[PDB]
Amino acid sequence: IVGGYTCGANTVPYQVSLNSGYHFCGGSLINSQWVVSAAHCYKSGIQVRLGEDNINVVEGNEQFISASKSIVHPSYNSNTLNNDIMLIKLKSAASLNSRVASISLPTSCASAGTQCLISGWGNTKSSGTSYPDVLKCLKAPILSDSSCKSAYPGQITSNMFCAGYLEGGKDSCQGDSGGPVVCSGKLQGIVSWGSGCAQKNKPGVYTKVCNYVSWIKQTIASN
Ligand SMILES: [Ca+2]
């Protein structure tokens, strides 16, 4: 997250870190057994880390649970990042508590102009690299479809939305991929892509989770 703030330990209790020996992506806990992330975060060999604040210090509220299964969307296209969504099943259920909690899936798609909470352990610099140890947060508004398409001509599908600030300075970034975009208390987006981070006229692009609720529900009813 570039231009964000330190969230505060465990104030984003649905945020997970995906670890393959190191943190490499975020995700969102949607019930005790399942995490939503980005398909471009797929790796074999994922451990889900819940209850994290500092990802480099065991502070006492973590749960580390191996994935048993990962399910990339059947229509994921890694070239365009259309359908950039994945489900990860935990080998055992998380113990839900004040620090480890699920986020609701949406009933309706979020509206342009809504301010959402985006969070992650990704890079904090637009130019260069600095990765934080504690979770960072950003409030960013959803942009209109027309503004999103103008920013990335020929690249935005109906399964993507833009959020952020066209002047630059505030955005998600590498290492935040797969993490949540929460709007009105629901998971509406997944950190998916953008041209650099926090550059002028290049807002973040997010997977539109409301288009995937029926797939998520049928897949979790079946696995
Ligand atoms: Ca920790």
Token pair 């060999």 is at which residue? 45
Task: Establish how many alpha carbons lie within 13 A of residue 18's alpha carbon, considering only the half-sphere containing its beta carbon.
Answer: 32
User: Which member of 84, 102, 119, 192 is catalytic?
Assistant: 84
Question: Does 95 belong to an annotated binding site?
Answer: no
Per DSSP bridges, beta strands 15-19 and 47-50 are antiparallel
Give me ligand 1 centre to Cα 60, in Å. 7
Question: Does 177 belong to an annotated binding site?
Answer: yes
Q: Which residues pair with 199 in a beta bridge?
A: 202
Distance CA 186, CA 209 (A): 10
Known catalytic residue at 84: yes
Give me ligand 1 centre to Cα 5, in Å. 18
Give me ligand 1 centre to Cα 55, in Å. 4
Domains in the chain, start-ordered, CATH in brackets? Answer: 1-12+103-210 (no CATH), 13-102+211-222 (2.40.10.10)
Distance CA 148, CA 133 (A): 31
Contact 220, 213 (CB under 8 A): no
The angstrom resolution of this structure is: 1.1
* Residue 13: C-alpha distances to residues 44, 88, 101 (Å): 25, 17, 5
Q: If 0-12 CB within 10 Å is exposed, 13-18 middle and 19+ buried, where does residue 34 land?
A: buried
Known catalytic residue at 177: yes
Q: What does DSSP assign to residue 209?
A: G
Give me ligand 1 centre to Cα 49, in Å. 8
Distance CA 167, CA 170 (A): 9
Query: What is the distance between the terminal CA atoms of the chain, rounded to a whole angstrom?
Result: 33
Known catalytic residue at 23: no
Distance CA 12, CA 100 (A): 9
User: Which member of 37, 40, 176, 192 is catalytic?
Assistant: 40
Solving technique for this entry?
X-ray
Q: Calculate the CA 67 to chain-centre distance.
A: 17
3-state class of 106 per DSSP?
A: coil
3-state class of 56 per DSSP?
A: coil
